[PDB]
Design an enzyme around this catalytic site. Structure first.
Site, mmCIF file in Angstrom:
data_model
loop_
_atom_site.group_PDB
_atom_site.id
_atom_site.type_symbol
_atom_site.label_atom_id
_atom_site.label_comp_id
_atom_site.label_asym_id
_atom_site.label_seq_id
_atom_site.Cartn_x
_atom_site.Cartn_y
_atom_site.Cartn_z
ATOM 1 C CG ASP A 296 1.212 -6.358 37.260
ATOM 2 O OD1 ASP A 296 0.223 -6.687 36.135
ATOM 3 O OD2 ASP A 296 2.404 -6.950 37.054
ATOM 4 C CE1 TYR B 126 5.224 -7.976 31.812
ATOM 5 C CE2 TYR B 126 3.278 -9.170 31.786
ATOM 6 C CZ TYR B 126 3.851 -7.975 32.206
ATOM 7 O OH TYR B 126 3.245 -7.237 33.021
ATOM 8 C CG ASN C 36 7.598 22.548 80.044
ATOM 9 O OD1 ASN C 36 8.572 22.938 79.340
ATOM 10 N ND2 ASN C 36 6.872 23.227 80.786
ATOM 11 C CG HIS D 139 -3.036 -2.825 36.421
ATOM 12 N ND1 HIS D 139 -1.599 -2.444 36.600
ATOM 13 C CD2 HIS D 139 -3.057 -4.197 36.685
ATOM 14 C CE1 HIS D 139 -0.978 -3.473 36.649
ATOM 15 N NE2 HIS D 139 -1.831 -4.468 36.789
HETATM 16 C C1 LIG Z 1 1.165 -3.803 33.512
HETATM 17 N N1 LIG Z 1 0.822 -3.264 32.162
HETATM 18 C C2 LIG Z 1 2.016 -2.930 31.479
HETATM 19 C C3 LIG Z 1 1.256 -2.500 30.179
HETATM 20 C C4 LIG Z 1 -0.052 -2.468 30.493
HETATM 21 C C5 LIG Z 1 -0.294 -2.985 31.499
HETATM 22 C C6 LIG Z 1 -1.741 -3.267 32.183
HETATM 23 C C7 LIG Z 1 -1.972 -4.226 32.854
HETATM 24 C C8 LIG Z 1 -3.158 -4.447 33.374
HETATM 25 F F1 LIG Z 1 -3.501 -5.566 34.223
HETATM 26 C C9 LIG Z 1 -4.047 -3.189 33.463
HETATM 27 C C10 LIG Z 1 -3.768 -2.297 32.564
HETATM 28 C C11 LIG Z 1 -2.600 -2.313 32.013
HETATM 29 C C12 LIG Z 1 -4.815 -1.452 32.521
HETATM 30 C C13 LIG Z 1 -4.698 0.088 33.180
HETATM 31 C C14 LIG Z 1 -5.587 -1.277 31.204
HETATM 32 C C15 LIG Z 1 -5.984 -2.311 33.356
HETATM 33 O O1 LIG Z 1 -7.169 -1.705 33.741
HETATM 34 N N2 LIG Z 1 -5.313 -3.395 33.838
#
Ligand SMILES: Cn1cccc1-c1cc(F)c2c(c1)C(C)(C)C(=O)N2
Ligand SMILES: Cn1cccc1-c1cc(F)c2c(c1)C(C)(C)C(=O)N2
Lengths: 546, 546
Positions: free
Chosen positions: A334, A465, A123, A523
């Protein structure tokens, strides 16, 4: 068996209730008990309040009718209302004070998660007050979590009229014995009960939820802390900006306020911010979650040089130009985190504030080739594996589901070695063919990433990269600078590559740097610890980004 | 022959110049003449200011270096700087005071319109001050109007170094004798002259433009008042929201601030607001220009009932919900104008303010069928012609170019009768096969509408007129209401259907109504009188919508 749960708004999903303020005002002004509640209900179904609730008149038209009822009631009770008596002031305060009853909303959310159809039946009135936005905001936040919202002023019917209950049942496409209906007004419960619905009279939330838990057989009280609200891709506003002839950038957009531009990492998506998008918009920000160049619905040209930081940053500036935004706060993770620090260094006028998750700001070393520098730390070997065009593309594209299931795992679930990726011939050489689903993700979330990467694959993403020398030369131009705009660095305890210690020298370049730190976080920060990410970002945004 | 025009920023495209404030400060503080200008240029190519201009350091890093130069200069001159002497305060004020030199920008705009490549070449800095947004805004407004923007701090070169002039010529892809270069600094003009470019030393704008007019042979001074900035569809941010399974709404988005939702009429497009979009965003608003349901990139279902006001309004509310917007200001024209009044009546909580161009608010008459009411006024006969499904579709779709060229004409150019459309068998029966281009539109603008209508044609758009009974019944529910939220009614003197007199009773329903009125304006208000529309809307938005 129950399959639908209906909730009232005032005194159920939102507290404190308005009828409580009528009583509270009576006591504060030492008026006869019930005077205001009596003037509010005056005339019953023929009264001003029923007309308001049916949508015949607006709240601003109703205010002087209530004032007249208050005078009439006071005359009969042989009392006088005070000199400064104002219905507008009383209701503005009450509406402003009313907040979402968080445990009730969580219970509604849990029932829907378990397959229940949920609705709000209320309401309510057509609010045309100067301060109506407060209530529009509350309703907006609440309504998104329910299948239906039925408002008396829109349907032209009110509780306790029998027709509104028949309207509800038709809307739910359910028989009465299949519905649980919660209300704080006993008289408004009677017709639902008379129809055969399970009814709960809400006084205190805890007792109401105990009754609800008993009748549904679903745990609603004492539950583990829920995750923040996520995003359904098909329900988001999707934006598209052409930054140059062959390049278009896609983004998801939610909320109003200062622009907050979220920049994901590798190999991700706008969707990596799914737990942040609703929370930041609710916090009072206009969120722009990108598909970075090379990803999702954004363009993915094949050329390496299209992914150097200078080009990427120029394009993000053009993105702001085309949207008519002089600034945005830039939040990255990242590779996104690396990009945002460079935005702060090269385009500070366009950056309201800057934040990075995991990625530290590390200045270029002008005395060492970037390739030499990467070789020095063994945890960065995956970046060397990513160098040769086609090698990592072949492994990552071979089986998309396996790729994302192997990558997106918590710190205590990883099947990835990271040590000697090149030597071992790949990232997944010691990984299962059919990885188990990590506790961070559902199968449905993995399939979204699989669907996105079907369009362009991994060339564009890997190219981020493949610009070490180009980025090093550009970064060297910034060596005499300092980052002096508002900045936040968020470290993740268990990121074994972007370790918290790597960020230790940042204050040398960013003297006013603010920090956040997440324990037991790997990560994939945003999905690993979404609640903690949200808390840190919102606190920093509110203090430093306005 | 000249084909490129290059403009400096400080003292040319923007006034007053900063070097003028160095002199003004010296006089205000009774310091020796040239003291501040001398400390500013101290060390020449090796000094702090050159490093700043090359992008080696940021503005905040430069401030204490300038302070030290000011101390050094004062010591030598045997004077003392005042107690409260602050370089930060002096520059904040100067940057804040600097505005766009409107006649210079207009001349740059005219040269580009006539085929010239235009660029801004400037000695500038990386601004990281807390108040940097003011300058980011100025640069944003300016840069959009030029082919190139070359900033010293981005390229790592400064005027008067020869290399920056070679960089400019390469960027323009032009030989020196093809370029006209305007600067307020004589020393910065010398290298351009030495290369063979036409140079103009800018003191007062009027003399500079006389020289520019003489050398290009293009009228730049004494020109007729230009139109507001328009939109290039391919340069806009395009948004898409699914409001329900089969319905998606498209919009164009520009700017930051309070959300302003523009709602076009029949048979139009988001593009009908092309002259308003840039102006409203520049005025400090986040513009959302819709493709209304049935149009352009928005969905166009075939069913009549999908276009009734109740459905259309519900969908616009869902549109706000999905974008995370609790409110928007709603501005409508023609059918868009009718929709916005109903948004105000049914969803006042979601409407920050409401404005209509031409379309008055007229309440439903509960004692007369809507068909009867339409028949009473002969100017509404076109609406009766639009009733029978397929009839008007056939005529309007037959030749798209002819349709838009016949419709989009000023009040003193119409080939449309409007009287006895049904009897005559159509709107274009007495219209030419190849209409002349109206002075309001270009061929390119007509072709955009032609391209848009190729997707869905006229069924969806005509269906907006095919819900008279349905809309009448819904509108009758609102008869006890008043519109009490901020409202603006804009009448057009020469709209022969939506005549200004038709709006005369609006104050009875909207007591606080504000008005605007446009003389010598026909039905196609936004493109007929864009400058006047912009003035009225911006003034009203700033006073009433915040
Ligand atoms: C982003 N990436 C692409 C392939 C692998 C990764 C990668 C990049 C990282 F900074 C990172 C990791 C993977 C793990 C999970 C090992 C960690 O603890 N740090
Ligand atoms: C919108 N529309 C579609 C077909 C014809 C019209 C239409 C509607 C009007 F309100 C109107 C006009 C045409 C003219 C230009 C005559 C005028 O002065 N007012």
């Amino acid at each position: 068996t129950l399959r639908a749960a209906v909730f009232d708004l005032d005194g159920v999903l939102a507290l404190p209730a308005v009828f409580g303020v009528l009583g509270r005002t009576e006591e504060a002004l030492a008026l006869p008990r019930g005077l205001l509640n009596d003037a509010f209900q005056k005339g019953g179904p023929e009264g001003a309040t029923t007309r308001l609730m049916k949508g015949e008149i607006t709240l601003s038209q109703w205010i002087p009718l209530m004032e007249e009822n208050c005078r009439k009631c006071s005359e009969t009770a042989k009392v006088c209302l005070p000199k400064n008596f104002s219905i507008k002031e009383i209701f503005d305060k009450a509406i402003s004070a009313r907040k979402i009853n968080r445990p009730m909303l969580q219970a509604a959310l849990m029932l829907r998660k378990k397959g229940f159809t949920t609705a709000i039946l209320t309401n309510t009135w057509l609010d045309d007050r100067a301060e109506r936005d407060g209530l529009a905001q509350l309703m907006c936040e609440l309504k998104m979590h329910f299948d239906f919202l039925i408002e008396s002023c829109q349907v032209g019917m009110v509780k306790p009229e029998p027709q509104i209950y028949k309207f509800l049942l038709d809307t739910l496409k359910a028989s009465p014995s299949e519905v649980v209906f919660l209300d704080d007004i006993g008289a408004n419960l009677k017709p639902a009960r008379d129809l055969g619905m399970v009814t709960i009279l809400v006084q205190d939330t805890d007792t109401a939820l105990k009754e609800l838990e008993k009748v549904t057989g679903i745990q609603l009280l004492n539950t583990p802390a829920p995750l923040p609200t996520s995003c359904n891709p098909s329900d988001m506003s999707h934006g598209y900006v052409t930054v140059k002839p062959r390049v278009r950038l896609h983004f998801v957009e939610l909320g109003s306020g200062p622009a907050v531009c979220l920049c994901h990492g590798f190999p991700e998506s706008w969707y990596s911010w799914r737990y942040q998008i609703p929370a930041l918009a609710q916090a009072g920000y206009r969120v722009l979650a990108m598909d970075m160049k090379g990803y999702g619905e954004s363009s993915a040209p094949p050329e390496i040089e299209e992914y150097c930081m200078e080009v990427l940053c120029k394009e993000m500036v053009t993105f702001l130009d085309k949207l008519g935004l002089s600034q945005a706060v830039f939040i990255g993770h990242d590779w996104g985190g690396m990009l945002v620090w460079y935005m702060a260094l090269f385009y500070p006028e366009r950056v309201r504030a800057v934040a990075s998750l995991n990625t530290p700001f590390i200045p270029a070393n002008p005395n060492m080739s970037p390739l030499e520098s990467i070789k020095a730390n063994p945890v960065f070997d995956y970046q060397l594996y990513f160098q040769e065009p086609g090698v990592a593309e072949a492994e990552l594209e071979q089986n998309l589901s396996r790729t994302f299931k192997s990558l997106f795992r918590a710190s205590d679930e990883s099947v990835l070695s990271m040590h000697k990726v090149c030597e071992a011939g790949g990232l997944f050489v010691n990984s299962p063919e059919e990885p188990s689903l990590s506790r961070m993700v559902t199968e449905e979330e993995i399939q979204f990433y699989v669907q996105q990467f079907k369009k362009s694959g991994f060339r564009g993403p890997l190219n981020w990269y493949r610009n070490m020398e180009r980025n090093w030369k550009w970064a060297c131009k910034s060596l005499g600078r300092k980052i002096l705009i508002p900045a936040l660095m968020v470290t993740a305890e268990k990121d074994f590559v972007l370790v918290p210690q790597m960020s230790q020298h940042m204050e040398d370049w960013i003297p006013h740097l603010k920090r956040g730190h997440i324990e037991d976080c790997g990560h994939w920060t945003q999905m690993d610890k979404p609640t903690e990410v949200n808390q840190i970002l919102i606190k920093w945004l509110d203090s430093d980004a306005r």
